[PDB]
C-alpha cells in the first residue's frame, strides 16, 4: 500500500505560510478555550491521533488520507474531544479550501507547537484525502492504564524507539487530562500552554502519590496539583526510559531537537515523497515575522 505525496496545485511555501499564520492568529485570538489553555494542546492531539493511527506492516491509517474527517474514526472513543480541535479548523480549511484535510491537521500540530514556542518542526505538503473505506477501525491508539512494557510495544507499530517515545511524550507538559474524555483528570505541570521540558522536570521532582480519581481509575498526582498517566509514570519506572528522561530534564535544547525530529516522523510516516519533493519547509512564528 503506498501513499505518494502530491502537492496541491501550484502551491509553494508561502501559500502553506499563509494557513500557518490563520492557524497562528486564530490561537491567539480564541484564547478563552478550555479555561484559558487555549487550542494548542489541542491541536496537537489531534495531529498526533490522526497519525498515531499508521501501522508499518501494511501502510493502514496514518496522516496520509485525512480520514479523520469520517464517522468511524471522528467518533472513535480513543479521540473524544478531539471535536473542538476540528472545529477551530473548520474556519481555516473554508478560507483555504485547496488545502488537504491530513495537510491541514498535521499543519495545525506543527503551528501549535511553534506558537506554544516549542522547537521549529519541518513540515511537508502533499497529503491526499482518500475515500471513507480507507479510514482505519478504532482501537490503533494507545491504553492510558498500562506499563511500560505495553508502551514500548505499542511504539514499535509506529517504528520508533525508546528515544523517540520519551521524547514524543514530553508533549504531555502541554493542556489536561478531562475527566469526560479519557476518565482522567488534571494537567501534568505549571506551564501547559508553553512547550518546555516540564513534563520531564515534574518525573523527577515531584512527589507522586497513586491516588483513584473520581472515574474509579488510578492516576499520580502531585501536591502542586499536576498528574500523570500510569503510561506516563511507566517511563521513571523503566531504567531505558528513566535514562532518557534524565537526559531531557537536564537539556532543553536536546529534548527540543530529538522532539521536532520525532514529531516531523510521526507526521510523515506512510507517506513516499518523490525524489522532487518539495523540501520540508520551516514555517516562520507570528513573532519572527512581526504579526
Ligand atoms: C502512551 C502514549 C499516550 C497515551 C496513552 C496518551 C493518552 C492521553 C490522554 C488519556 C490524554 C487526555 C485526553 C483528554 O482527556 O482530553 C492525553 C492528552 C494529550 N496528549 Fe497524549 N497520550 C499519549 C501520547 C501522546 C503523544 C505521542 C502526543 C503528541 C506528541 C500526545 C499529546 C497529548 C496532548 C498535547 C494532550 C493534551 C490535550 C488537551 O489538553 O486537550 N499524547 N493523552
Known amino acids: 500500500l503506498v501513499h505518494v505525496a502530491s502537492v496541491e496545485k501550484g502551491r509553494s511555501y508561502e501559500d502553506f505560510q ?8 486564530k ?8 479555561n484559558y489553555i487555549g487550542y494548542g494542546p ?30 468511524k474514526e471522528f467518533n472513535d472513543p480513543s479521540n473524544a474531544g478531539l471535536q473542538n480541535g476540528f472545529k477551530f479548523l473548520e474556519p481555516i480549511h473554508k478560507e483555504f479550501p485547496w488545502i488537504s484535510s491530513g495537510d491541514l491537521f498535521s499543519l495545525g500540530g506543527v ?42 510495544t505499542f511504539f514499535q507499530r509506529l517504528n520508533m524507539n525508546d528515544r523517540e517515545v520519551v521524547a ?8 489536561k487530562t478531562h475527566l469526560k ?29 497513586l491516588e483513584k480519581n473520581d472515574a474509579n481509575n488510578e492516576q499520580w498526582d502531585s501536591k502542586s496539583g ?4 500510569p503510561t506516563d509514570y511507566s517511563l521513571i519506572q523503566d531504567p531505558k526510559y528513566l535514562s532518557i528522561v534524565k537526559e531531557y530534564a537536564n537539556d532543553q535544547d536536546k529534548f527540543f531537537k530529538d522532539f521536532s525530529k520525532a514529531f516531523e516522523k510521526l507526521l510523515e510516516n506512510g507517506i513516499t515523497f518523490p525524489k522532487d519533493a518539495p523540501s520540508p519547509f520551516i514555517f516562520k512564528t507570528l513573532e519572527e515575522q512581526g504579526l
Not at 490561537?27 to 478550555?34: M, P
Not at 501494511?58 to 480520514?67: L, Q
Open 18 to 25: 499563509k494557513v500557518y499564520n490563520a492557524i497562528a492568529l
Open 111 to 152: 503551528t501549535a507547537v511553534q506558537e506554544m514556542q516549542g522547537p521549529k518542526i519541518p513540515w511537508r505538503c502533499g497529503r491526499v484525502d482518500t475515500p471513507e473505506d480507507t479510514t482505519p477501525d478504532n482501537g490503533r491508539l494507545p491504553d492510558a492504564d498500562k506499563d511500560a512494557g505495553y508502551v514500548r
Open 181 to 209: 474524555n479519557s476518565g482522567y483528570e488534571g494537567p501534568g505541570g505549571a506551564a501547559n500552554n508553553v512547550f518546555t521540558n516540564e513534563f520531564y522536570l515534574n518525573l523527577l521532582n515531584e512527589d507522586w502519590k
Open 42 to 71: 489541542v491541536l496537537v492531539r489531534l495531529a498526533w491521533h490522526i497519525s498515531g493511527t499508521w501501522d508499518k506492516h501494511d501502510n493502514t491509517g496514518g496522516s496520509y488520507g485525512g480520514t479523520y474527517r469520517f464517522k
Open 168 to 175: 514524543l511524550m514530553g508533549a504531555h507538559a502541554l493542556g
Open 27 to 34: 490561537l491567539r485570538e480564541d484564547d478563552e478555550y478550555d
Open 226 to 229: 499536576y498528574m500523570m498517566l
